[PDB]
Amino acid sequence: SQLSFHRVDQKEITQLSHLGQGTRTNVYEGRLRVQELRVVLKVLDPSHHDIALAFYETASLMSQVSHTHLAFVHGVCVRGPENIMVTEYVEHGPLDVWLRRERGHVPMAWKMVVAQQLASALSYLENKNLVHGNVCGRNILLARLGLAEGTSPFIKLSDPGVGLGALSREERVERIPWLAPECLPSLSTAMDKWGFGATLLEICFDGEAPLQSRSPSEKEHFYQRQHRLPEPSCPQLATLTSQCLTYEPTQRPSFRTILRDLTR
């Protein structure tokens, strides 16, 4: 009753190559006939009704927002028990993978453009009072490389996939340190300030995230002990990442402050 998205007919979609896995999903290159548009198909695992609902809730969220740095959702194809989200194909793929592959020739200026674009997407959702809840390098898609002389990068933040509210505690621990600490045991836009902070660290460290090596027990203990995440060596950027990565959600800065700080 609360939800609104386009139903996509199975006859309108073609599934091409496998691109990877998301949370409870397999992602394929596809075609959507509307013209034969390149898209990605996100195929939900066999799931309980509650996970399918959480999937529809994400489709509904993304279908009623617009921003140049938010990826487009075309709709959902049902096929009895099978659920497919149809979403924007973004040329150069996930940023975390891209950064790890390009390690050693991504300049700071390039990274600062990406942080500004992500901040302008999250400023828009803050103003709408809508939670993304899965801000991370994997969900930042690179539309334009921006490494050539006289070019700049262009990103699209992916749909967050299955809503965080429907995932297991095990899955939430796996998402440390992108997971806001209040989300371990909380659905406020404040969680995206933390995720933003974690994603800046991830970008600064060329797609290596802090804590990623550590076991689930050690990731959970980090949060229980309110250990501080590492500060990048650029102190101006450290002040910002630290303010975002504040355990008390009400002490994290607005995206007005964040954008102000990034733009000088």
Ligand X SMILES: CNc1cc(Nc2cccn(-c3ccccn3)c2=O)nc2c(C(=O)N[C@@H]3CC[C@H]3OC)cnn12
Using the contact rule CB under 6 A, the part of the chain among 43-51, 86-94, 227-235, 255-263 near ligand X is 86-94
**One character per residue 18-57, x = contact with ligand X (rule: CB under 6 A):** -xx-x--x-x------------x-x---------------
57-77 burial string, b = 16+ CB within 10 Å, else e?
bbbebbbeeebebbbbbbbbb
Window 161 to 220, contacts with ligand X (CB under 6 A): 161
Window 90 to 119, contacts with ligand X (CB under 6 A): 90, 93-94, 97
**Residue 179 Cβ, how far from ligand X at the closest point, in Å?**
16
Query: Contact between 63 and ligand X (CB under 6 A)?
Result: no
**Alpha carbons 202 and 99: distance in angstroms, whole number:** 9
**Residue 44 Cβ, how far from ligand X at the closest point, in Å?**
10
Window 2 to 21, contacts with ligand X (CB under 6 A): 19-20
Q: DSSP strand E in 45-198: where?
A: 73-79, 82-88, 140-144, 154-157
SS3 22: strand
- Among residues 172, 137, 161, the alpha carbon closest in space to that of 23 is found at 161
Q: Of the candidates 5, 55, 89, 98, which one interacts with ligand X according to CB under 6 A?
A: 89
Window 221 to 260, contacts with ligand X (CB under 6 A): none
Residue at token pair 């921003």: 67
Size of the site for ligand X (CB under 6 A): 19
**Alpha carbons 261 and 264: distance in angstroms, whole number:** 6
**Residue 99 Cβ, how far from ligand X at the closest point, in Å?**
12
Question: Which DSSP state fits 162?
Answer: S
For 51-77, the DSSP string reads HHHHHHHHHHHHHT---TTB--EEEEE
Which residues contribute to the site for ligand X (CB under 6 A)? 19-20, 22, 25, 27, 40, 42, 71, 87, 89-90, 93-94, 97, 138-139, 141, 158, 161
